[PDB]
């Protein structure tokens, strides 16, 4: 049970980190599309460029 539960916990963390990375930048993609950020060129696109590392952390 345990090692199979362990390797599946490895397997889901693989699935965790991958599609997170795949979506949060895809979120960061359309973050610009249809909106030039809140009040500046850089602003929430920094805001989103800093929020997404603590989500993995």
């Amino acid at each position: 049970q345990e090692n199979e539960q362990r390797r599946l916990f490895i397997q889901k963390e693989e699935q965790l980190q991958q599609i997170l990375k795949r979506k949060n930048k895809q979120a960061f993609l359309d973050e610009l599309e249809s909106s030039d950020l809140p009040v500046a060129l850089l602003l929430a696109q920094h805001k989103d460029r800093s929020t997404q590392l603590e989500m993995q952390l």
């Binding site: 895809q26 610009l32 599309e33 030039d36 060129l41 850089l42």
Partner: protein, 315 residues
């Protein structure tokens, strides 16, 4: 058609180039190229900024100032005549899109800082950042990942225009294999890279990429990972020389994805570095000879400095 980046600027704004009367921005220079040389050093000498045509190189008391910039100031210059320890003329051209590790305003500052506020005519100004630095990586997923830049403030115009034109989107035996994928880091900062629009749209895209005010840098990620095959390269004791050792170092100062075009003088290691690029890069390469005259030659030093010949020869 669709082949128009920024052509060389100066065409007007000057009448009887003996500007003994006007020289107005040169008067800004000639103030400080002349107010500065009093106590045994010049601390001046603006490279003799001339608005039309080109400007010069001082190169007669370079010491450290213009002797470092005997080379470095020459990036967009070309130094077309050569001389003795005197002045040295140049021309001016497209060579800022090569100089893309630096901003057109950053050089403009040092263009002023060399010139001791010897101020531009503006002619160069209206031709400084006409093409913002922008690359085109060809990343592992078979065509390209839609790389932008280290710097973000360019997608803001782009993604508000481009997708509304065209969208984008055993153990130890394998432990090191992800340690290589661990090395696939942030591309020096943030990358801002998007997903391939189906490989048949970039031709439709490139013609509109330049259409605003940007220009694109096609790359070649063919060295770390490559999905098709790799030929047998082999550099059999081909000791070479630092004129062309610098060359591929200019072709590769970055990672494994950047194309290259290098000028040599005549009779130089022409059939060497391409043969060096034939083998080091690990590609499946092509030579386009001028005539069969070239074709016999270029394989021959390839037959010399490569042992890749077992009917492995395609002329």
């Amino acid at each position: 058609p669709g082949n128009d980046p920024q052509e060389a600027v100066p065409s007007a704004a000057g009448k009887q180039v003996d500007e003994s009367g006007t020289k107005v921005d040169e008067y800004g220079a000639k103030d400080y190229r002349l107010q500065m040389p009093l106590k045994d050093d010049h601390t001046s000498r603006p490279l003799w900024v001339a608005p039309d045509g080109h400007i010069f190189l001082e190169a007669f008391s370079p010491v450290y100032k213009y002797a470092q910039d005997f080379l470095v100031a020459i990036a967009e210059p070309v130094c077309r005549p050569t001389h003795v320890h005197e002045y040295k003329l140049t021309a001016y051209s497209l060579y800022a899109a090569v100089s893309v590790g630096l901003q057109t305003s950053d050089i403009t500052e040092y263009l002023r800082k060399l010139s001791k506020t010897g101020v531009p005519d503006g002619i160069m100004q209206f031709i400084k950042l006409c093409t913002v630095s922008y690359g085109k990586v060809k990343l592992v997923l078979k065509h390209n990942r839609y790389f932008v830049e280290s710097c973000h403030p360019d997608v803001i115009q782009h993604l508000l225009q481009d997708p509304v034109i065209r969208e984008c989107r055993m153990d130890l035996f394998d432990f090191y294999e992800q340690m290589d994928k661990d090395e696939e880091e942030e591309e020096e900062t943030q990358t801002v890279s998007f997903e391939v629009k189906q490989e048949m749209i970039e031709e439709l895209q490139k013609r509109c990429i330049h259409l605003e005010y940007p220009l694109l840098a096609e790359y070649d990620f063919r060295n770390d990972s490559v999905n098709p095959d790799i030929n047998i390269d082999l550099k059999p004791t081909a000791v070479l020389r630092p004129y062309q050792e610098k060359s591929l170092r200019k072709m590769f100062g970055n990672g494994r994805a950047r194309s290259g075009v290098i000028v040599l003088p005549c009779g130089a290691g022409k059939s060497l570095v391409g043969v060096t690029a034939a083998c080091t890069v690990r590609k499946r390469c092509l030579v386009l000879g001028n005539s069969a005259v070239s074709v016999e030659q270029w394989k021959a030093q390839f037959k010399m400095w490569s042992t890749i010949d077992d009917s492995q020869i395609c002329r």
